[PDB]
Amino acid sequence: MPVFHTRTIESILEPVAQQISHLVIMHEEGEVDGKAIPDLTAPVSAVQAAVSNLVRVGKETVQTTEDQILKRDMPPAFIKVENACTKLVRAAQMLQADPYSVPARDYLIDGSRGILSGTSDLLLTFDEAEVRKIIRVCKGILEYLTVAEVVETMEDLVTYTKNLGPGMTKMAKMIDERQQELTHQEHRVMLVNSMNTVKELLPVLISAMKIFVTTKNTKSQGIEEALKNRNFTVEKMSAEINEIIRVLQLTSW
C-alpha cells in the first residue's frame, strides 16, 4: 500500500494489500482480459455489507466522541470507501451482462484499491487518536517536572515523589507497549533509549532534591551543587520526553 504503521494495522491489511498489488500487475499485464469473470454478485454483496457496517460504526464514533481532531479527519474515509463500493457494485452489474466487460475490470481494480486506501485511512485516524492519548500522559509528566524547583521541604519532596513515581510507571508502560507495535525499527530504538534515559535520571533527580531539601540552611556547597544537579536533570529528562513525543508522531516517507 506500501508499509503499514503498526503491527496491528499490518495484521489487518497486509494480506489484502499484497493480493491487490498482484491484481494490479495482472491487470496492467492484461492477464484477466482473456477469460470470463464469474458472477461476483455474492462476493461484492459481502463487501457492500462490510462497507455499510464500517461506515455505520465510524459515523457513530464521529458523534459519540469528545475528540475534535478525530471528528474532522474520519469522515473523508467514509466518502472514499463509499466511492470504491459503487465501482464494485457497478462492475458486478456489468459482468452479469458481459463477463468480458473491460470497464468492469477497471472498476474492480480501482474499487479494491479504494477499499484498501479508505480502510487504511480510517485505521490510521484511530491510531493517531491513540497516540494523542499517550502524548497527554507525557505532557503531564513534563508539567510536573517544571514544579520540581518549588519543592523546598522533606514533606514537599515525599509528596512530589509519591505523585511523580506512578506517573512515570504509567508512561513507561505506554511507551513500552507502543514501541512493540511500531513497524519501523529505528523509531523503536529511539523510544526505548529515551525511556531508558528518563528512568535512569529519576533517582538522580530525587537525590539532588533530597540534598537541597535536607541541607538548604547549612549552607554547605552541596546546596549549590544540588540546585545545579536538579536543574540539569529536569532539563535532560524534559528533552528526552519531548523526543518521545516527537518520535510518537513520525511518519516515514
Binding site: 489487518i12 494480506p15 489484502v16 491487490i20 498482484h22 462490510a50 460504526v57 480502510t119 484511530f126
Partner: peptide, 22 residues
C-alpha cells in the same frame, strides 16, 4: 478499535479479489 469491522471488510475484499483471479 474498529478492528472487527476493518478485518471483516479486509477479508470480504480478499474473497472478492480471489474470485476475480480464479
Amino acid at each position: 478499535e474498529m478492528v472487527r469491522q476493518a478485518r471483516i471488510l479486509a477479508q470480504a475484499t480478499s474473497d472478492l479479489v480471489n474470485a476475480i483471479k480464479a
